[PDB]
Write a protein that binds this ligand. Structure first.
Ligand SMILES: Nc1ccn([C@@H]2O[C@H](COP(=O)(O)OP(=O)(O)OP(=O)(O)O)[C@@H](O)[C@H]2O)c(=O)n1
Ligand SMILES: Nc1ccn([C@@H]2O[C@H](COP(=O)(O)OP(=O)(O)OP(=O)(O)O)[C@@H](O)[C@H]2O)c(=O)n1
Ligand SMILES: [Ca+2]
Ligand SMILES: [Ca+2]
Lengths: 214, 229
């Protein structure tokens, strides 16, 4: 039915672009499709959805969703801050750049590129809510792409990321391999590889169950 | 009619992406749409078109055009090398990255706690200049027209036409399409700075109109150049 009726949901999706000059940037390969899918399913289930979108694979605005377009990780941060005070659910599906060029050239570059860190927006929301600044925020959802490497298997890294971020739910993609839904209470649920819509339904199901538990 | 009948055209379009690791890259804001429009007009007018496409995942493949997909400027270079021997016209509409990161990480660079490491850059080969030189060295006997594209702006050192003329003579191409950019949309300002520059000294204004109109003017200019020879 419409379980999300009355819920205000803030979703980020797509990759950010960190400018080097007016023409060039550091970007990433995120398509935004999974984040758009979650926004679409939330709206379909009655939520009042605001979608902050960075760079996407040409995607169409989902119907009934309020669109906010950003470029950089800092612009995404400011857009999340602007829209956070009344949101009940934050879904951080955007591939947010960890670093940005330290200097942006005023004109086209005809030179090593120095980098500085961007703010961790997801962690900022978790801390703000813990510090009493987001009383309406009932669920904070992070996304992660994890792989096994010489320092640990994929699930080890995913669990560590849940613990460090402190969010309520971590949607993990193992990079047709299945992913995971990791909850802050320790629940771990396999996320089967299906269409983006079916996976979005499973993600939103988990959000709805978490909201009912609280 | 079909003036481009019998012409084999190799077109590059879109921006390139220069990897930092499997997920991140240096990129640019070019859409590839103007180059796609030139390929589409060439085919509509009878040309046998091969389109080497960069960062254009959401664009529709032009009908009747052979598609070649590349990622980086070096991959674009290699694709042009492979396909140029078949072409009579090379249309270099791609926004090719001048630089690439010197090191490509095997895995996505992790957010540590120490200071982030700068990115060293290295120059990518000038594909257009490489084609001009190969033709001059006798390696491209079928190549009748080499077309470059450039976005130029006036700055403290000169206006658009000053910079554009200098780039044409410098690149050594037969035609330089200057500022075939913009979408002619509401609230988009037209700086009336579009030009078609020929290596014989002819200079014609390129009106900023739709992508299809500009592609038609560009292909008209190619046809006029081919007929001049
Ligand atoms: N500057 C950033 C970076 C990431 N994110 C959010 O954090 C989650 C992904 O974090 P991740 O990149 O996996 O964690 P990092 O601390 O950056 O660790 P890593 O070294 O693996 O990149 C996503 O929800 C993403 O939207 C964010 O809010 N702000
Ligand atoms: N590594 C490169 C760079 C650009 N091009 C081609 O060169 C033309 C545009 O050149 P432009 O970027 O305007 O001149 P540059 O020599 O790169 O000078 P600038 O730094 O001003 O860009 C286009 O046709 C583009 O496809 C190319 O073949 N190989
Ligand atoms: Ca990161
Ligand atoms: Ca350039």
């Amino acid at each position: 039915h419409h379980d999300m009726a009355g819920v205000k949901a803030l979703v980020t999706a797509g990759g950010t672009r960190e400018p080097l000059d007016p023409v060039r940037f550091i970007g990433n390969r995120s398509s935004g499709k999974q984040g758009y899918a979650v926004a679409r399913v939330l709206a379909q289930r009655g939520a009042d959805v605001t979608l902050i979108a960075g760079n996407t694979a040409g995607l169409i605005d989902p119907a009934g969703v309020e669109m906010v377009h950003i470029g950089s990780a800092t612009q995404l941060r400011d857009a999340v801050s602007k829209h956070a005070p009344d949101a009940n659910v934050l879904v951080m599906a955007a591939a947010v750049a960890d670093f940005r060029p330290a200097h942006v050239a005023a004109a086209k570059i005809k030179s090593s590129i120095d980098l500085v860190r961007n703010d961790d927006v997801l962690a900022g929301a978790v801390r703000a809510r813990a510090d009493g600044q987001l009383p309406n925020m009932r669920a904070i959802v992070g996304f992660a792409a994890e792989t096994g490497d010489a320092n640990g298997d994929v699930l080890f890294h995913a669990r560590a990321k849940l613990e460090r971020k402190g969010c309520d739910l971590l949607v993990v993609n193992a990079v047709h391999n299945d992913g995971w839904l990791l909850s802050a209470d320790g629940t771990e649920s396999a996320l089967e590889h299906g269409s983006k819509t079916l996976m979005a339904t499973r993600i939103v199901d988990s959000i709805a169950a978490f909201l009912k538990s609280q």
